[PDB]
Amino acid sequence: TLTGLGLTASSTFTTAAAAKTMIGTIDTALQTATNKLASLGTSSTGLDTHLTFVG
């Protein structure tokens, strides 16, 4: 959710300089989102491996 990425529900730019900073903000958001999702996928594969072992 936006709050977890560091974006705020009110977030926007009203002038060109704010947009020039928003580029870097959205870069950081995309980075952290991909890292979180990669951790979720790793944990899912770990659940699958444990499921086969339990069987």
Binding site: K20, I23, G24, D27
Partner: protein, 54 residues
Amino acid sequence: NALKSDFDSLRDQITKAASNAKFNGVSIANGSTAKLTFLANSDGSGFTVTAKTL
């Protein structure tokens, strides 16, 4: 007097032609702004083009 009047008409024509030189509300010749900065990379760094008045 005739030559001077033609010179004045050409002067006004230069003012008009300089005022009309705009592309989608932005100009690099009219002198409205010191500079313009077009994008140069995905990080937002900008290629710079210093304005030239006419």
